């Protein structure tokens, strides 16, 4: 009956971390594309 | 009710992992910038 406020924080903390990983994924996607372009220029 | 404390600790471990990944990623983003700029 206690610790239901705590579970709240956990679950929104997981939304926090997923949203951070999702943002990180977009930036990583961009660096991969950027490297591909740089590799194509040499070849 | 004892398992809550390993969840919170694991959330701290993941956050710390994602923060170290972000340093690495900022580093590679900056490196890419300098390679683009040498081309231009």
């Amino acid at each position: 009956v206690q610790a239901r406020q705590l579970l709240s924080g956990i679950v929104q903390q997981q939304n926090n971390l997923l949203r951070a990983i999702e943002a990180q994924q977009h930036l990583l996607q961009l660096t991969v594309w950027g490297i591909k372009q740089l590799q194509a220029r040499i070849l | 009710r004892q398992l809550l404390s390993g969840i919170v600790q694991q959330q701290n471990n993941l956050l710390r992992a994602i923060e170290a990944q972000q340093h690495l990623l900022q580093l590679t983003v900056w490196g890419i910038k300098q390679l683009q700029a040498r081309i231009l």
Binding site: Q2, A3, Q5, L6, G9, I10, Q12, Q13, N16, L17, R19, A20, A23, Q24, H26, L27, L30 | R1, L4, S5, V8, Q11, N12, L15, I18, E19, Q22, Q26, V29
Partner: peptide, 28 residues
Amino acid sequence: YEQKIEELLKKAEEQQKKNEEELKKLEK
């Protein structure tokens, strides 16, 4: 993107602090 990631990380740092206080505030 970097600025967005920093804001989400900052948020998760505070929320992690809240949950650890909620976790210590789990006893008698």
